[model samples]
Target: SPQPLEQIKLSESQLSGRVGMIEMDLASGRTLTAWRADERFPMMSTFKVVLCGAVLARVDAGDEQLERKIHYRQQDLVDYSPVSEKHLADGMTVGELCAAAITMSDNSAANLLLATVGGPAGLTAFLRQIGDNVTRLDHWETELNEALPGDARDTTTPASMAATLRKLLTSQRLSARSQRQLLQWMVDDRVAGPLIRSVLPAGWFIADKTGAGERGARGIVALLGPNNKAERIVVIYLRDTPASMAERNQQIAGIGAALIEHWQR
Candidate 1:
C-alpha cells in the first residue's frame, strides 16, 4: 500500500474535496497519521457522542440519572428520528436516548439529550471543561448539518474531536460505568459500522459514529484495530465536495483500508 498520506491524498483528489484525518494512539495520545488535522469541518450528527458524554458526566456527578424518562410532544419531532418517534407517549430513558442517538443517529433523540444537557451552549461549556476548546456546538440537529459554504457553525477539527473523544472515553473524566456504557453504545452502532466494516479486511474491529450533510460533508470518528481490540482512534472528515453519498462513503472506507494495511508501518 502507498503511504497513509499518499492514500488519503489520492482519495481527496478523486472526490475533489478536503479530507481531514487523524489516527492517534488511545493510551499515549501519539498521532500516527495527520492530514489537515487542525482544519474545521461540519460535525453533523457526530456531535451526539459528545452530547452523550456530557450527559454521562452529569450522571456521574449525581445530577442526572440514565433511567429518568423524558417525554415530548409531536412538535418536537425532527427528521430521521427512528427510535424517538416511536415512543412519544411513553417517553424514553436517558440511556435509551443516548443509544438511539449514537446507534441509530436519531435526530429527535439527539435533540432531547441536547436539551437535557442544556442545549448547544451547555454542551460547548462541557467541552471547555474537558479541555477541548476547539470543538463547538452552535445549533441543534437538522440545522447543524446544513454544511453551508464558508460556515463554521457546529464544526470541529479532527485533532480536537479525537482529543476530546480520548478524554471522554479513556481519561478519568467520566466514571467507570459511564465509560463502559459509552463504549458499548459505540460498539453497537448501526449507522456507519456496517459500511466501514464491509470495507475493512478480516480480523479488524470498528466502533464509530458517522455524520453527513449538504455540500458533501461526511465524517466518521471511530476506534478501529485488528484482532478485535481498540488499538487506535481514527477521525476522518470530508467537506465542500459535490460527490455522491456512495462516493463519499467509499472515500472514508478507503482511508480505513489504508490504516489496516499499514498498521505495522
Candidate 2:
C-alpha cells in the first residue's frame, strides 16, 4: 500500500512546463513517479552528467587517464564559462575538467571533457552502449551559448536520466569507485546549488547533477540518503517555464520538500 500525497496536487500548477520526476527505493529498486517520466524533454546542461559517463567509460577501458593534462584553446573560452573566464593560462587535468563541468557548470570544462571523451558521435555511442537510446546530446554548449532559439535543444527523458544515475550507483556499468567520484563532484556542485540539499529532512544528503538550458529548461538527477546509502533517488526534468531563476528555485524547493515527506511515508 502507498500513502497518499497531497503536496503533489499543486505540482502541476506551480509552473507551466513539462516535468519528469520519480522516487526510487534504492534497496528494492522500487519506484514511484508522476507519469511522463519516460517522455523526452530538453535537458540542457544536464547532458554534462552523460558526458561524465562517456569520459569515465574510457577511463574504465584504460583509454583515458584522469591525470592527463589538456590545454584550453582561446576559442574554447565561450562567454558564460566560469573555467574560461578565469584565464587559466596553463592547462587542467581530465578529472579537474570533469569536476568543473559538474560543480561549476563551466561550459569550457564540459566542451573539453566532451572532446576528450570523443565528441558528440563518441558520446552518443557510449550512451547507446550503456542502453540509453532515448537521450541525445546534439552539440557543445559553446555553439549555443545562449538560450535555444526556442526550447529546442538536446533532450532526455526523466526515466533515462534516472536510469543513467542508477548506473552510477548499481555498478551495472561504472565501477563503484568511479561512481563515488562522480557523486562527490555532484555533492560539491556549486553551479546548481542544492535544490534538494536545501530542503532535505535532517538525515539525508543528495548527489545530483543540475542543468540550466534555454527557455526556462532545468533538470536534476539526484541520489538521496545518509551514510553513502540511498533511501530514495529523485530525477526531475523541466522544460519551458517562467524564465526567472528565483521563481524556478522556489518551485523546486517546494517540490523537494514534498518529495521528502512522501519518501517518509
Best by lDDT: 1
The estimated TM-scores of all candidates read 0.98, 0.88
lDDT of 2 by residue, 93-175 (tens): 89988888888888888888888767877787777888878776767775532345343346677777777667655656877
Candidate 2, residue 148: lDDT: 55
lDDT of 1 by residue, 139-166 (tens): 9989999988878779999999999999
Q: How many clashes in each candidate?
A: 0, 0
In model 2, where is the ten-residue run with the lowest total lDDT? 1-10
User: What local lDDT score does residue 155 receive in model 1, on the 0 to 100 scale?
Assistant: 94
- Top TM-score hit: 1
Q: Which parts of model 1 have CA positions greater than 4 angstroms off? A: none
